[PDB]
Amino acid sequence: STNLKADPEELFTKLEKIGKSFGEVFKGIDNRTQKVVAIKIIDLEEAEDEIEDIQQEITVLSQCDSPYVTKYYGSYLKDTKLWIIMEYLGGGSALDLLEPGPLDETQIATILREILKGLDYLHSEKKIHRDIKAANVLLSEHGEVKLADFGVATPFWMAPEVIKQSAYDSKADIWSLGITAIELARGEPPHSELHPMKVLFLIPKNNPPTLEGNYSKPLKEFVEACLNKEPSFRPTAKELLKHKFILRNAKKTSYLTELIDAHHHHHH
Ligand SMILES: Cc1cccc(-c2ccc(-c3cc4cnc(NCCCN5CCCC5=O)nc4n(CCCCN)c3=O)c(Cl)c2)n1
């Protein structure tokens, strides 16, 4: 829960404004430990309609304890400002890492495997991420891959049952993972050139997207397995960890430092 006694302005120093996000996000330092943290500051008088959503995200993150989910350290409330203290990951988001150029299939498989480990954790804990996309997958400077920015309980990554405002479950994350696989391979999710309101009707109406281009058969098959219109027919995260695409192509996460280094030199 939130600390209303301690002054976060004395506990933390802001180092950099980051997260170009709801509320302002900073790379910061815990003055006592000298560990770097991510700090989101939300003015609760400005964000009154979103307060329950904020509380729900804090609650879910506070219940997670996994190397695959960005850690929640705590929160502070000073005057009208809520400070949320999180683990800082310095490598970049998976979306950021698409900037230098296309990923190879080893990089795609490695990132997907780690996302699957986070989904396996969340689904085993009766949680649903709800916003799996490359922008919400964060890498440490060592190549560790973690999930961030859970969705509240833009349409391009949403499963058809979620769009139809129907009951849904963890299988919605598997659909979003399939869209994210396309995004990691092509740079953008399907329908990215279309107005979001048109995408709202296309996703439930149309056959599921496919991965188009010169990619290995197992990668195309991985995408196809995830993007089943029927949620019950999508595999679980545990099953996808055994998929031929993953087993044949995923490697040690430390190899992703080469991708991180490339982004240091080629970025907007
Ligand atoms: C409303 C609510 C309720 C509960 C928690 C939060 C919340 C969600 C996410 C976070 C957050 C953490 C975070 C950790 N590392 C990084 N590393 C930056 C990577 C990119 N680089 C590299 C060089 C400089 C730079 O910019 N960025 C983080 N970002 C910003 C990116 C979001 C992507 N979707 C966060 O927003 C927090 Cl603190 C609280 N929110």
Is the Cβ–Cβ distance between 169 and 231 less than 8 Å? Answer: yes
Resolution of the experimental model, in Å, one decimal: 1.5
The alpha carbon of 60 and the centre of ligand 1 are apart by a number of angstroms equal to 16
Q: Which two tokens stand for residue 259?
A: 């991708």
Report helix, strand or coil for 69. Answer: strand
Query: CA-to-CA distance for 102 and 111, rounded, in angstroms?
Result: 14
Tally helices (H) and strands (E) across the chain.
Answer: 10, 9
Per DSSP, which regions of the chain are E strands? Answer: 2-3, 12-18, 24-30, 36-43, 72-78, 81-87, 92-93, 137-139, 145-147
Give the pairing type, strands 92-93 and 137-139: antiparallel
Query: CA-to-CA distance for 207 and 197, rounded, in angstroms?
Result: 18
Asked how this structure was determined, the answer is X-ray
Is the Cβ–Cβ distance between 258 and 141 less than 8 Å? Answer: no
Domain map of the chain by residue range? 2-88, 89-266
> Which ligand 1 atom is the nearest neighbour of the CA of 25?
36
Is the Cβ–Cβ distance between 133 and 180 less than 8 Å? Answer: yes
Smallest Cα–Cα separation from 88: which of 32, 153, 146? 146
Ligand 1 pocket test: pick from 24, 39, 86, 144 the residue with the most ligand atoms within 8 Å of its Cβ: 86
Distances (CA, A) of 50 to 4, 43, 53, 54, 93: 20, 11, 5, 6, 25
Query: CA-to-CA distance for 185 and 180, rounded, in angstroms?
Result: 9
> Which residues pair with residue 49 across a beta bridge?
none
Residues designated as active site = 131
Q: Which two tokens stand for residue 215?
A: 């990619």
Alpha-carbon radius of gyration of the chain: 19
